[PDB]
Structures are given as structure tokens and as C-alpha cells.
Design an enzyme around this catalytic site. Structure first.
Site, PDB file in Angstrom:
ATOM      1  N   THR A 143       0.856  -1.184   0.000  1.00 40.78           N
ATOM      2  CA  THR A 143       0.000   0.000   0.000  1.00 40.78           C
ATOM      3  C   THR A 143       0.894   1.236   0.000  1.00 40.78           C
ATOM      4  OG1 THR A 143      -1.854  -1.111   1.069  1.00 40.78           O
ATOM      5  CG2 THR A 143      -1.852   1.238   1.252  1.00 40.78           C
ATOM      6  N   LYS A 185      -1.459   5.394   8.663  1.00 36.81           N
ATOM      7  CA  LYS A 185      -0.664   5.265   7.425  1.00 36.81           C
ATOM      8  C   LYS A 185      -1.503   5.510   6.151  1.00 36.81           C
ATOM      9  CE  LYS A 185       2.076   1.939   4.805  1.00 36.81           C
ATOM     10  NZ  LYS A 185       1.786   1.122   3.622  1.00 36.81           N
ATOM     11  N   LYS A 197      -8.307   2.045  -3.204  1.00 39.43           N
ATOM     12  CA  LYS A 197      -8.140   1.697  -1.825  1.00 39.43           C
ATOM     13  C   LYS A 197      -8.086   2.954  -0.909  1.00 39.43           C
ATOM     14  CE  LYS A 197      -5.242  -0.476   1.588  1.00 39.43           C
ATOM     15  NZ  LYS A 197      -4.591  -1.677   2.145  1.00 39.43           N
TER      16      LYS A 197
HETATM   17  N1  LIG Z   1      -0.785  -5.751   8.079  1.00 41.00           N
HETATM   18  C1  LIG Z   1      -1.993  -5.450   7.568  1.00 41.00           C
HETATM   19  O1  LIG Z   1      -2.969  -5.631   8.263  1.00 41.00           O
HETATM   20  C2  LIG Z   1      -2.207  -4.915   6.171  1.00 41.00           C
HETATM   21  C3  LIG Z   1      -3.465  -4.942   5.522  1.00 41.00           C
HETATM   22  C4  LIG Z   1      -3.573  -4.458   4.200  1.00 41.00           C
HETATM   23  C5  LIG Z   1      -2.420  -3.936   3.545  1.00 41.00           C
HETATM   24  N2  LIG Z   1      -1.209  -3.871   4.208  1.00 41.00           N
HETATM   25  C6  LIG Z   1      -0.007  -3.296   3.586  1.00 41.00           C
HETATM   26  O2  LIG Z   1       0.851  -4.365   3.253  1.00 41.00           O
HETATM   27  C7  LIG Z   1       2.203  -3.928   3.209  1.00 41.00           C
HETATM   28  C8  LIG Z   1       3.112  -4.840   4.057  1.00 41.00           C
HETATM   29  O3  LIG Z   1       2.463  -5.137   5.302  1.00 41.00           O
HETATM   30  P1  LIG Z   1       3.067  -6.144   6.419  1.00 41.00           P
HETATM   31  O4  LIG Z   1       2.137  -6.039   7.609  1.00 41.00           O
HETATM   32  O5  LIG Z   1       3.302  -7.502   5.798  1.00 41.00           O
HETATM   33  O6  LIG Z   1       4.393  -5.322   6.829  1.00 41.00           O
HETATM   34  P2  LIG Z   1       5.591  -5.928   7.745  1.00 41.00           P
HETATM   35  O7  LIG Z   1       6.439  -4.733   8.041  1.00 41.00           O
HETATM   36  O8  LIG Z   1       5.011  -6.924   8.678  1.00 41.00           O
HETATM   37  O9  LIG Z   1       6.414  -6.740   6.608  1.00 41.00           O
HETATM   38  C9  LIG Z   1       7.144  -6.102   5.579  1.00 41.00           C
HETATM   39  C10 LIG Z   1       8.330  -6.981   5.294  1.00 41.00           C
HETATM   40  O10 LIG Z   1       9.093  -6.434   4.212  1.00 41.00           O
HETATM   41  C11 LIG Z   1      10.433  -6.800   4.459  1.00 41.00           C
HETATM   42  N3  LIG Z   1      11.285  -6.013   3.573  1.00 41.00           N
HETATM   43  C12 LIG Z   1      11.659  -4.727   3.729  1.00 41.00           C
HETATM   44  N4  LIG Z   1      12.469  -4.384   2.698  1.00 41.00           N
HETATM   45  C13 LIG Z   1      12.572  -5.425   1.866  1.00 41.00           C
HETATM   46  C14 LIG Z   1      13.189  -5.738   0.594  1.00 41.00           C
HETATM   47  N5  LIG Z   1      13.905  -4.857  -0.097  1.00 41.00           N
HETATM   48  N6  LIG Z   1      13.050  -6.939   0.081  1.00 41.00           N
HETATM   49  C15 LIG Z   1      12.328  -7.862   0.651  1.00 41.00           C
HETATM   50  N7  LIG Z   1      11.714  -7.640   1.790  1.00 41.00           N
HETATM   51  C16 LIG Z   1      11.806  -6.487   2.453  1.00 41.00           C
HETATM   52  C17 LIG Z   1      10.565  -6.533   5.944  1.00 41.00           C
HETATM   53  O11 LIG Z   1      11.718  -7.123   6.523  1.00 41.00           O
HETATM   54  C18 LIG Z   1       9.280  -7.095   6.493  1.00 41.00           C
HETATM   55  O12 LIG Z   1       9.359  -8.494   6.910  1.00 41.00           O
HETATM   56  C19 LIG Z   1       2.202  -2.479   3.688  1.00 41.00           C
HETATM   57  O13 LIG Z   1       2.417  -1.650   2.532  1.00 41.00           O
HETATM   58  C20 LIG Z   1       0.862  -2.332   4.426  1.00 41.00           C
HETATM   59  O14 LIG Z   1       0.346  -0.971   4.565  1.00 41.00           O
HETATM   60  C21 LIG Z   1      -1.103  -4.344   5.478  1.00 41.00           C
END
Ligand SMILES: NC(=O)c1ccc[n+]([C@@H]2O[C@H](COP(=O)([O-])OP(=O)(O)OC[C@H]3O[C@@H](n4cnc5c(N)ncnc54)[C@H](O)[C@@H]3O)[C@@H](O)[C@H]2O)c1
Ligand SMILES: NC(=O)c1ccc[n+]([C@@H]2O[C@H](COP(=O)([O-])OP(=O)(O)OC[C@H]3O[C@@H](n4cnc5c(N)ncnc54)[C@H](O)[C@@H]3O)[C@@H](O)[C@H]2O)c1
Ligand SMILES: C[C@@H](CCC(=O)O)C(=O)O
Ligand SMILES: C[C@@H](CCC(=O)O)C(=O)O
Ligand SMILES: [Mg+2]
Lengths: 290, 291
Positions: free
Chosen positions: A93, A243, A168
Site C-alpha cells: 500500500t 498510514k 483503496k
Molecule cells: N498488516 C496489515 O494488516 C495490512 C493490511 C492491508 C495492507 N497492508 C499493507 O501491506 C504492506 C506490508 O504489510 P506487512 O504487515 O506484511 O508489513 P511488515 O512490516 O510486517 O512486513 C514487511 C516486510 O518487508 C520486508 N522487507 C523490507 N524491505 C525489503 C526488501 N527490499 N526486500 C524484501 N523484503 C523487504 C521486511 O523485513 C518485512 O518483513 C504495507 O504496505 C501495508 O500498509 C497491510
């Protein structure tokens, strides 16, 4: 059965990738946080030492990353590594502006690209009931569908690149406004001597009904499954809502659009996030009681 | 059942014609001759003063513009009514005014409900109004056979004033939602997301509400919405503004914190200075006034 590189295996990526493995895809993972990487490997993801390696033999590359900046950096790091005409799907997102920039970058490297941000949170992710809101070409989406189906409850084509992010962010701005407005109604009701149950039965049977009340009711009792009944445990955290609202305000600023209640809600949630980033976003009701 | 109907205006006239249509003897008063004579044309026995209309009545319904007029109507007629006359106020007035007039009527041995309504003139004519009722359940039960021929829905909200409180809380939310939906449609357009796509998403997602699924403020996605017919009400900005004023009175009287509802009320008060006659969804076109 395609080979998919999955970059970002955190709270959303890990369950997403697991469903892909369960559906018979070969999943090649990278995440620089080893705990995330390790958990993903336990469910059958082949974990690699770097993102370029994971991408090298992939038909599809999914990114599920925390910010536009991170996605940009990741694309810069890996696009040359990928085989020509690999399909990139960003389910992060991120701002409309960032989404369009990364899309253009992917295409300038000869790669197909869609934005496909999701709703449903971790629970939706684990159950494979997420909604994907997709921007890009219809034909690219047709090519992507077999990859997205195993993760998805719904797939919705919203328009050209960036439109998934746009749809979204528009919905979530409306949702924030609705959640505060519901909370305000319930507190006012309380001060007027109208019971929570009676207000609930009116609004839900009337023109004001909306998810923020019917599923996310911010007072305990009328909807026993809502977060108010469970100490405002997320649910959808204030940190995440804050966010999404920052991204909505980025969109407002990039367009010169006027969103008086949307920006007022962003301001309310940014303050509430300072101390209550961990509570469900329905907990903003606390700020309305003396 | 003999019914005195005081206030025979845009809402009162069709409501009273439904009562006549259901076999009630309807006695009427309105100080506008055109209202009165129109009501006499559908079977209401029109009198020259409200105390006269009330004299022979088992039920007295008021449909009046303000709490101060309802209060003055009550003190004009209560001594004219028989004991245990059932008074129903279907005006939309403040919770404070509602409760004071209820106490006034019961002090005279009358039974009283607040029963404001949602549904406008169309709903009044079609007998599909939603009555939101405050007062005793045993009094609502007695009132039911009268309400029914005017009504699509009858909801008991609580003790006296709860009808007014429920309606004013829902309409505050409605105002906020209508503006929020408008913001989203304008923002989508500037982002290059089509109105149809946004509509398809929001209506299938957490932001869905009547403001979009029925009152969509851009033409196309809902061909019957006011946006496709020059924003003909529908539900006028005039009326929405009125309800929000009452919401603001209730916020002030209670010391409540209602930032978005209060914001909404400001936007609609301003929009009503210019577009009182347009459907309240037309607010989509006054967003750059606040730029
Ligand atoms: N958690 C939710 O409830 C939810 C719901 C809908 C959408 N989203 C969106 O989903 C996205 C990710 O959410 P999340 O909760 O999984 O975040 P998170 O921070 O739990 O996981 C993100 C992961 O990305 C990894 N990362 C960072 N840089 C990287 C790279 N260059 N290569 C590979 N991996 C890398 C991090 O180490 C981490 O494990 C966000 O943009 C968020 O706003 C989240
Ligand atoms: N018009 C609507 O769409 C609508 C919808 C729902 C609720 N309401 C509410 O209903 C009430 C009135 O609605 P309306 O649309 O009929 O307004 P209206 O102004 O058309 O009718 C009011 C009528 O009452 C008369 N009147 C004034 N003082 C009186 C008295 N002491 N005794 C008898 N009659 C008196 C006026 O001459 C007028 O004809 C308001 O409180 C309004 O907010 C209106
Ligand atoms: C969402 C997808 C079906 C796959 C699923 O139910 O996981 C579709 O048909 O759009
Ligand atoms: C069916 C409806 C009764 C009103 C009527 O009969 O018109 C209701 O119970 O609300
Ligand atoms: Mg009040």
C-alpha cells in the site's frame, strides 16, 4: 503452476506466500529480516540470500513491502536481475504517485507491472479472502489471475496503473470519516440518554448504516464480535489507518483536491496514533469522552 | 378514533389524508388557508382554532416547524382536550423541547409520544414514513393503529425524547457520509480513477453507505440518484441544514465533542445560503468554496 519470487514475507507476505505454496506454486522468497524469512521457509518458501537471486528464475515477482520508498529501492535493486517480460505485482500500500513511478520504472526495464494493494489484514491473508484492487492493463491482469486467485476472496480491476492504490485510499479515507462519525453519534446518544442498543438499531436500519457501525460498533454490546468487546485489540490498527490516511493526504496534496472531512479525520487519527497506535481504529471514541 | 391534526403543511396534509383513508375521523387546524382548504378537500374537518379541533379528539397529532410553536400549541390546547387524550408530536424538534412538552402533556393527565419521521413528502404521501418514537411502550401500543396507516416503519427508541435523539444522531452521520462520499468522488476523478470504478469498489467494501449506493453524487452509477436530475430533492439542503442545527443544539446542550458532525453542519449552513433547494448530495460542487 508458475515460479513466483515473493519479496517481503512479514505479517501479510508470510501468509500470502503460504497459500501460494499450498496451491502448488514454487515460491522463491526474500526478506532481510531473518525471522520473517525463517517462518516463510517453514511453510515451504525457498528462501534466498538476496532479492536479485530470488527474482532470477521467476515468471512473477510479488512485492509486499512497507512503503513507496522501500518498493522503489527494491525495484531499483532487482529489475535488471529479472528475465525480460517477467510480471511484477506490487501488493504493498503506497501513494498513487509512488505507484505510477515504480510502474513506469518496471516497464522501462521490459517488465509487466500491476499495483494490487489489498484489504482484509492478516486474517484475510491467512484465509485467502483478501480483496485485490488492481491497476494496470486488463491483459496483464488476465495473465496474473491464476497467481492472485489462491490469495483472494475478490479481484477488482480499478483502471490504469495506480488505480488500485487510488481506489483503496479513497475507500479508506471514507471509512475513517465514518468511524469517527459513528463514534461521535454514540457518545452524543449517551449524553442525550439514548441507549447504545437503541441507536444501533436505528442507524443500522436507517440511512446512516455502514460497516463502521454494523461490524465495527465502537461501544461494547450490540455487535459482540466488534473490537470494543475485546479491549479494542485490532482489527484494523490505528497505526495502519493513520498510514492510509497519510497516503490519502499525499493524494490530496498531489491533486490539489479539497477533502475537508477527510483531512480533518487524518488530523484526528495522527494525534490518536501518537499514543494509541496499537488499538483498533474504532478506539478513537475514547477521545470524545471527557 | 377521532384525531385532531394540527399542522397540515407539506407533511401534515398527506399524513392526514392517509388517516382519513384508513377510516378515522380527522379534525384539522392550520393557520395557512391554502393548507387548511387543501386538507378539507381530502376529508379533514377544518376548524378555525387549534383548541376547537382538539375538543372531540381521542388523539392529537402535531406536525409543526419548531419546538417553540409545539410548546405554544400545547399550552393553547391542553385544557381543551379530554383526559387521557393521546398526544403525538411528529415535528422534528430538539430533545430538550421534546421532553419539556412531554412533561407538560403528562402533567395534564394526557399520554404523549415524540414520533418524528424520516421519508419526506414522498414518504408521507405513500404512507412509508419511518416513525422513531420516544415514550412508554404501553402508550406506543395504543398509538400503533394510528401510526400504521401513515407508516412503513415504527421504531421504539426509548423514553420520551429518544425519538428525536435517534433521528438527529442518524442524520448527523448521514450529513458526514454525504460529504465524505463527495470528497472521495472528487479525489478519484483528480487521480484518474473513473466514477464507475470507485463506485464498484466502495459499494463492495467497508466504505459502502446509502450516500453512495442510493444517493451517488456523480451521474451514471445510480441512474435514479439526484445527480442525474439536476439535484432535484430528494432530501433538500434546507432540511438537512435544519436537522444539523438541531444536532448542533444537542451538542451544545450536552457539552458533547462532535468534530466531524460540527464540521458538516458548518459546510451545510454555508451551502444552504446558496443552494437550499438542491438535494443535499449537491455539496460535491461546493468543496472548492472551502479551498
Ligand atoms: N498488516 C496489515 O494488516 C495490512 C493490511 C492491508 C495492507 N497492508 C499493507 O501491506 C504492506 C506490508 O504489510 P506487512 O504487515 O506484511 O508489513 P511488515 O512490516 O510486517 O512486513 C514487511 C516486510 O518487508 C520486508 N522487507 C523490507 N524491505 C525489503 C526488501 N527490499 N526486500 C524484501 N523484503 C523487504 C521486511 O523485513 C518485512 O518483513 C504495507 O504496505 C501495508 O500498509 C497491510
Ligand atoms: N417537509 C419534509 O420533508 C419533512 C420531512 C420530515 C420531517 N419534517 C418535519 O415536519 C415538520 C413540519 O413539516 P412540513 O414540511 O409539514 O412543514 P410546513 O412548514 O410545510 O408545515 C407547517 C404547517 O404548520 C402550520 N402551523 C404553524 N403554526 C401552527 C399551529 N400552532 N397550529 C397549527 N398549524 C400551525 C403552518 O401554517 C404550516 O402550514 C418540521 O418539524 C419538519 O422538520 C419535514
Ligand atoms: C477471488 C478469486 C477466487 C479464489 C479464492 O476464493 O481464493 C476470484 O474468483 O476472483
Ligand atoms: C408494517 C408496519 C406497520 C405500518 C403499516 O401497517 O403501514 C410496521 O410494523 O412498521
Ligand atoms: Mg437538545
Amino acid at each position: 503452476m508458475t515460479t513466483i519470487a515473493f519479496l517481503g514475507l512479514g505479517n501479510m507476505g508470510a501468509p500470502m506466500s503460504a497459500n501460494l505454496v499450498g496451491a502448488g506454486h514454487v515460491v522463491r522468497g526474500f526478506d532481510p529480516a531473518p525471522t520473517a524469512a525463517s517462518g516463510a521457509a517453514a511453510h515451504g518458501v525457498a528462501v534466498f540470500r538476496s532479492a536479485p537471486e530470488a527474482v532470477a528464475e521467476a515468471d512473477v515477482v510479488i512485492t509486499m513491502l512497507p512503503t513507496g520508498e522501500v518498493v522503489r529501492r527494491c525495484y531499483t535493486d532487482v529489475l535488471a536481475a529479472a528475465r525480460p517480460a517477467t510480471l511484477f505485482i506490487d501488493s504493498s500500500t503506497i501513494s498513487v504517485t509512488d505507484a505510477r513511478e515504480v510502474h513506469a520504472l518496471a516497464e522501462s526495464h521490459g517488465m509487466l507491472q500491476l499495483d494490487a494493494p489489498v484489504s482484509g489484514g492478516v486474517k484475510g491473508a491467512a484465509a485467502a479472502t483478501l480483496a485485490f484492487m488492481v491497476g494496470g492493463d486488463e491483459s496483464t491482469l488476465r495473465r496474473a489471475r491464476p497467481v492472485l486467485e489462491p490469495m483472494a476472496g475478490k479481484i477488482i480491476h480499478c483502471g490504469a496503473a495506480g488505480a488500485g492504490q487510488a481506489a483503496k485510499v479513497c475507500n479508506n479515507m471514507v471509512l475513517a470519516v465514518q468511524q469517527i462519525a459513528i463514534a461521535e453519534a454514540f457518545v452524543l446518544a449517551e449524553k442525550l440518554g439514548l441507549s447504545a442498543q437503541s441507536l444501533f438499531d436505528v442507524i443500522t436500519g436507517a440511512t446512516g448504516n455502514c460497516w463502521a457501525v454494523h461490524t465495527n460498533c465502537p461501544v461494547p454490546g450490540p455487535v459482540p464480535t466488534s473490537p470494543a468487546n475485546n479491549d479494542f485489540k485490532p482489527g484494523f490498527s490505528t497505526a495502519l489507518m493513520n498510514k492510509d490516511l497519510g497516503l490519502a493526504m499525499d493524494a490530496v496534496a498531489a491533486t490539489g483536491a479539497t477533502a475537508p472531512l477527510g483531512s480533518h479525520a487524518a488530523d484526528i487519527y495522527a494525534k490518536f496514533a501518537a499514543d494509541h497506535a496499537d488499538l483498533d481504529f474504532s478506539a478513537v471514541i475514547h477521545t470524545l469522552r471527557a
